[PDB]
Nucleic acid binder design. Sequence first.
DNA 1: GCTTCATCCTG
DNA 2: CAGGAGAAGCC
Length: 256
Amino acid sequence: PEGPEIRRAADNLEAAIKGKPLTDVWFAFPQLKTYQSQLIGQHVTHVETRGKALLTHFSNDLTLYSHNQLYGVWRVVDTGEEPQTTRVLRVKLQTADKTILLYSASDIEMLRPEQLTTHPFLQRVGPDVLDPNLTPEVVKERLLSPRFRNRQFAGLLLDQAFLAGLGNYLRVEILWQVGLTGNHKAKDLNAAQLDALAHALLEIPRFSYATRGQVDALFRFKVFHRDGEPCERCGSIIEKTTLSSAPFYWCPGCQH
DNA sequence: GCTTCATCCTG
DNA sequence: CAGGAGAAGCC
Ligand SMILES: [Zn+2]
């Protein structure tokens, strides 16, 4: 679940309960139980995302921070209904007609304003690829800054301190799109390559967000999990190798 | 960057 | 039933 999936989730959560008075609130964690009575009657004002971090803001200035990491998942159901699953329920925010449920996630914390501005993660993450204000220009600027210009892409594209929201599938799909291997550094690219990379870093995540689900051609994986299969661009056989602690899918025939 | 955490999926 | 699929740890 990378930036695009998380924003899609957040949009569904907002459509479900944004602005509606909470009729019941439940948290699995003992440390969060105290907030149950405090939030009943309040309402979610908006669901903000920063990369894969999701922030559910409430009308009393509290904010529930949740990060699904590799296994958390939200579900929208009609109030009263309980999904058929073996997953562990961690949060229930219920309104008159709709209820949202967070399953499996382990990183869940209730934040006060002071904790928001200085949260370790929220404080170290870089600009969000889904942020409309972020442009290819600013992205190029970032890639060439002394801070990132010498970083190999294999690790850079997974680092949320560079651009928030990029995960392993976006990492491999972006690099394949621009024909680059994971060992490249922004400082060694020619102007044409840097431009393509800069645009792809924003356009692919935004394309997945807009079309992988919901919609309104369609996003699809070109190399992610297609190792052993022929590249649709050059026909070479896609390979898989571990780079920066995550499986790197790439085509030796058109990625250089 | 390497290892550990943490939950569900998979060979 | 290992260990594969995004952090925090360890600072
Ligand atoms: Zn190819």
